[PDB]
Scaffold this active site. Structure first.
Site, mmCIF file in Angstrom:
data_model
loop_
_atom_site.group_PDB
_atom_site.id
_atom_site.type_symbol
_atom_site.label_atom_id
_atom_site.label_comp_id
_atom_site.label_asym_id
_atom_site.label_seq_id
_atom_site.Cartn_x
_atom_site.Cartn_y
_atom_site.Cartn_z
ATOM 1 N N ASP A 35 43.984 25.766 36.580
ATOM 2 C CA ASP A 35 43.903 27.442 36.303
ATOM 3 C C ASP A 35 42.854 28.045 36.138
ATOM 4 O OD1 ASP A 35 45.038 30.372 35.976
ATOM 5 O OD2 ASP A 35 46.491 29.563 34.514
ATOM 6 N N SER A 199 33.510 43.201 40.949
ATOM 7 C CA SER A 199 32.974 43.045 42.604
ATOM 8 C C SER A 199 32.353 44.368 42.694
ATOM 9 C CB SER A 199 33.869 43.013 43.271
ATOM 10 O OG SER A 199 34.110 43.829 44.677
#
EC number: 3.4.23.22
Length: 330
Positions: A35, A199
């Site tokens: 994770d 992004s």
């Protein structure tokens, strides 16, 4: 040193991936959920409340000649999906894919929430976010990667998650045969303890690319892609009959639909998520309403590039003094 381990989807939807991890001496192999959105290595154990164990493999520290109680240390974690676990702490030898760390904090669960009990395939979590998020008190502990870093050939790990198939976690090296083209690296902020990046935009299907900054985290422990409501609405508007259902908890779509791809930007590069990756199947057995793999992050407080996004790429988690992320197509 290096390590390399195969990671395997737990079910036919790729809801999560499990990776075998050797703990203790002799080894006890547990299948952990790696994770990158958390920083605790915790396991089902011989200390876990018996009614909260249902098919998981447990770590028994008393059977490990290298286990040592970390005296006074406790831990307690709550995840973004509302699940939680807590317990005490041992140090022990932990190996992943041939890479061994001695003295790793292994957090033994005394209590786990129902979603963990109900998932017999996941024996615990191995956190790969920054050690500033580790919950052990009163002495915070380091992640497996942080402990291994100095010994690795290069201070990196890579995630290569499969679509409906196994993939690979590598430690200490870049496998240049595992991706196509070049890897585009992008800046990381560690201020919240995550692999947080920006992004450069998105496209829906064959549509034009929208240049827009989308801050979010690379999170292998989250199944879906959670993005701003504007972006998510633009995606689902291209699927006839798709709608947000408050009763189901997100966007659903007719199972008869063919889904468009979704592209996200990494610098000037582009990662394409095929439409198939966005199908999470019937909302309940036999239903013709299917659950979408792109959902709104409104109310979560952060955008999350979970497995839906990451499995479309070869992803480099560069843990150099100034960390960066790399993405390549594959």
């Amino acid at each position: 040193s290096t390590g390399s381990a195969t990671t395997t989807p737990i079910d036919s939807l790729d809801d999560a991936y499990i990776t075998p991890v050797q703990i203790g001496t002799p080894a006890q192999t547990l299948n952990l959920d790696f994770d990158t959105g958390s920083s605790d290595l915790w396991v089902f154990s011989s200390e876990t409340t018996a009614s909260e164990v249902d098919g998981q493999t447990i770590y028994t520290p008393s059977k490990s000649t290298t286990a040592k109680l970390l005296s006074g240390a406790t831990w307690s974690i709550s995840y973004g999906d509302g699940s939680s676990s807590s317990g005490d702490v041992y140090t022990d030898t932990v190996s992943v894919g041939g890479l061994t760390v001695t003295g790793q904090a292994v957090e033994s669960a005394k209590k786990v929430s129902s979603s963990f009990t109900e998932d017999s395939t996941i024996d615990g979590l191995l956190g790969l976010a920054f050690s500033t998020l580790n919950t052990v008190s009163p002495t915070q502990q380091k992640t497996f990667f942080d402990n291994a870093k100095a010994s690795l050939d290069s201070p990196v790990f890579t995630a290569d998650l499969g679509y409906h198939a196994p993939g690979t976690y590598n430690f200490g090296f870049i496998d240049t045969t595992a991706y196509t083209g070049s890897i585009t690296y992008t800046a990381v902020s560690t201020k919240q303890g995550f692999w947080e990046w920006t992004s450069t935009g998105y496209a829906v299907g064959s549509g034009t690319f929208k240049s827009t900054s989308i801050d979010g985290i690379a999170d292998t422990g989250t199944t879906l892609l959670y993005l701003p409501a504007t972006v998510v609405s633009a995606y689902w508007a291209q699927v006839s009959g798709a709608k947000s259902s408050s009763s189901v908890g997100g966007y659903v779509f007719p199972c008869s639909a063919t889904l468009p791809s979704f592209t996200f930007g990494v610098g000037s590069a582009r990662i394409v998520i095929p439409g198939d990756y966005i199908d999470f199947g019937p909302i309940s057995t036999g239903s013709s309403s299917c659950f979408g793999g792109i959902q709104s992050s409104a109310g979560i407080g952060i955008n999350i590039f979970g497995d839906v996004a990451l499995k479309a790429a070869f992803v480099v988690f560069n843990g150099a003094t100034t960390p960066t992320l790399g993405f390549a197509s594959k």
